[PDB]
Amino acid sequence: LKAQTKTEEFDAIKIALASPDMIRSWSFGEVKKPETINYRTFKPERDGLFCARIFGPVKDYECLCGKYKRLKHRGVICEKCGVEVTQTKVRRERMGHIELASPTAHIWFLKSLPSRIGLLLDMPLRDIERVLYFESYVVIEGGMTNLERQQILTEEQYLDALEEFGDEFDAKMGAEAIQALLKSMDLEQECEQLREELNETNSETKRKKLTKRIKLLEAFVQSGNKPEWMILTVLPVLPPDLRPLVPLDGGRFATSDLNDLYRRVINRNNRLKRLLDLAAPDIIVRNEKRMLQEAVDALLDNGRRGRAITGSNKRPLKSLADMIKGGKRVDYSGRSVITVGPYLRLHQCGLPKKMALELFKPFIYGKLELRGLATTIKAAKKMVEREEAVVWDILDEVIREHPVLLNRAPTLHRLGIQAFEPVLIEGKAIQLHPLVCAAYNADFDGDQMAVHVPLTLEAQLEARALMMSTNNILSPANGEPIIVPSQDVVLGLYYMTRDCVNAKGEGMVLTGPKEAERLYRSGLASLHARVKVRITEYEKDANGELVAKTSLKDTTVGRAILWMIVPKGLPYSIVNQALGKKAISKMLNTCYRILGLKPTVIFADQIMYTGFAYAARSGASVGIDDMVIPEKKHEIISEAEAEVAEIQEQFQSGLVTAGERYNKVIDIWAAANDRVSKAMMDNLQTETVINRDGQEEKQVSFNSIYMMADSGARGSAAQIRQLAGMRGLMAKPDGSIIETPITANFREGLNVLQYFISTHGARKGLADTALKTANSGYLTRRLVDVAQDLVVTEDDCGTHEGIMMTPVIEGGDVKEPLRDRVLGRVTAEDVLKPGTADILVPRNTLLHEQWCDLLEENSVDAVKVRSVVSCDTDFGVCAHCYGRDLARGHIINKGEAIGVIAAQSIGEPGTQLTMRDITGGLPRVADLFEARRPKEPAILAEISGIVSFGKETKGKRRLVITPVDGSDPYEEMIPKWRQLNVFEGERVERGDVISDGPEAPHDILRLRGVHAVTRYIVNEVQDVYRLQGVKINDKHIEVIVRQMLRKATIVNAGSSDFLEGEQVEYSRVKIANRELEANGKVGATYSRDLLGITKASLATESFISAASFQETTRVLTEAAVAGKRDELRGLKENVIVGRLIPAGTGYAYHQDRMRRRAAG
């Protein structure tokens, strides 16, 4: 016995047409005057666009006149002027209406792609539906003689037909004519007769329009909306506050364009009302009606036809629709320039004193008044406004364990916003941990980040348990660590290895920590020798725990002292025995997988501190003599120019093909470039001589630059090759290459010519960079919009099927293996073993248990694994079928947000993608996801049969292949263009190649199989990242392809109406509820359909979510026609409404509320 009549909690919102009486329900009065504000008193007019009696009072609680002032009469209206004295915010919510004389057509339901008023009535839009209501050609409204029911007549035809009959087929013209036309229309009887007629002896020559309109008519009649509301007779008014005329600075009012529109429509409507009382000339009144139509159409939605103007501005007027067709500023926030903070930890950030003072203002107030000090709230304000020392100490209390999350401008992925613990710093800049400075893709060029203060209690815990930097150790994209040490730190730890012979070396042995005393006390060097020491190692096995292992290994000084940083576990020494390069991340990785979170974090801090400290101790610099040029440079150049000279001389005397000597001479300079590069590298690498004991030996150059190159720290082969070697073949604006490479280098001088040549590369480089940077996000938006609705739910469902995972092998003719694509994956079912047993059924491939897939030899290179592609889930994703790949080591928590994380991870490396039988680059990725047919698509055999010619070019035609076997034939169409691959008589299988060209994803999914098409997409999208060298897990690709295969097409006979292509969501849930419901014959069989990201995102349940990205004017209108309702599980549509997101910290709320909405 509920039935409450207040503003409580809503479970859904409904959209539909509005009746004239429905408009009256919102009406708090009727605007009748074009007047707005008084010219002198600046007071709201009687019944103008800004009435006080109709809408709301100007001041809060005092009326218009002033008979009543204070809160004494808040429920009683004024005597002299019916003004309800409540609030001033009432003026913001009060509606109101205008009641027009002659009917008027709504611009949306009239001319918006399909003629909603036309298609429902079956009548031409801008052709017939225009001329009959613009007062030109009269229309019929049902005739029982000579005239049909919807024909168009002229005035001559009208009077003639009227004279022949008349007084028994009356049919007006104009707006009200179309009104009676829609009103007289019977949706029910037409729904019956149309179903009857559009089914009688008709092939595929009619079925199109038949099924279309019948579904549309059925939708409209079931919607509840009456076709009468199609053209409005009462036009509601938007609240004054949402279109105010506020005085600016020194007079000069500022009003909205809507006021101009409403003022115009009011004027024309009034004159129309006055003309229908005075003399009534047909031409004058009919014109005023067309003018009234103009005003209304302009107010509702300008668009669209010439564009109304006035208001002095040459620019159009922002209509109602224009204000809702096409960034959330927030309190408790700030921003500033970032700065490196070495002394900081991994979970801390440098927050400015004055900045943090203003941020936690309300918290400082409360805490002050809590302890004492400030007698009141305003006392705290005056106490912090006058920074009185003691207040700062209070600040140290409020920001104690109150996390603050930082954010960078280019937010590509989830690690764009990470939380930290605030640490007061005497300065006006924000300091950041140099480790998480890579996740942000942030540099200190002058970049500035923003800070937000988690106000809510659970918001603070959200920032601490989710957005905290310590919880984001591994990248969401690839399982590898993200906080891995970079340039400076890695260079330092690289210097802490690097075994140099002799030089204060000798094998003076000690015991770990003791060696530290040796280093500070000079005597011995640091990069020697090697030298032996006692290492107390620690390992565990089977029953875990710890097993000591003291030994005597031959390391170095650096390795020994650096060994102290290494945590309890780890293989020890051997991780330090190497050097500093890429294993620097490997060590961090293994430390995480064998120990845990905290140990990995402290290990990261220690290796960072150590790296920085010893890096400073090293004093590695970059002099001009550090980049040594090869002596054989001029030799190589002369030899190369000698060869090209011979080639040019040959070209002079014919002989060689002059048409392509350009290419071969390029090979000459290119080969020469490799000669110089190889020479420089072989030189700058080794070198040195030292003098070990009896002298004479060779190691590797301690040449700073090389040290930077052989240890990450921003230094690649190509760059170094340009520093001392030479800049090779340079690009030309034509797209061609110049046959005179930059012989010189940056170490040497650069001629004006070759620099004016390199300026092109730099220009196109920056230009292309600017393009792909915005284009990457351009792709990300489509990815997110289509995927940001699926969330891992229902724990872990059943099913065993799943793509058979195999190492991506180009080794067929090039040799290239990759077999790490199986880890943290939930096994399908006991994937065999050369003998028996072994792998379990649903056992997720552990990080240590994937190394067990090497103890089964190279024989086992194929394992069936559950993926998001398959999964017999409904509206979510099985936890097992997904994986575990996060910053977390375990499986994805139930109710995460796979969609956005997947899309982000995909569009994150988009910045480093070079746009162009191999397209390659970002455009290749876009084409693969959009599922576009190639420029020369191949063809396959749909059914296995016998290949034979089907009448050599007898059409039309063009060759024809007919693979017929078993039963029934097929006639494919070959257009002569492009050859073949299978002779006549030969047999083919189900999906064989008969064109040997580019394959179309649609054909693969349609014929080959879902596993095949998904394998195709993932293995083709990776191949463009292989070349770009961007590591990204296949899971996310499988995630987007999952809902990429959202909808399908049924072909048989069931409760669903055949031709309708519907998503496998309702399909599967309904086919499961039909085999054991009444009969399996009341349902049909479906067939998966491949549709691109854009095409897939276009279709969605919520009309609000759709109103977001795609054209609002369309979706909102069509959703208005049929009584649709969002209810209401989508992420996007639940964001603009301002409520808990149906995922993450929420979900449980939505789950409880979802089950709660089952009672009624």
Partner: protein, 57 residues
Amino acid sequence: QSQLKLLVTRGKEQGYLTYAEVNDHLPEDIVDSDQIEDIIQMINDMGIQVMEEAPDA
């Protein structure tokens, strides 16, 4: 005939949606702000089937 065959045969699918093309191959008085929306609505979005909803309209 003319409008239908030209629109369909040409736009397949004009790749970058070459708007400044067929709008000149249309009769009647030009430079209008009315026929502008009726072409940007048919090319994309509801592809294939929309190109059959255009001629009929």
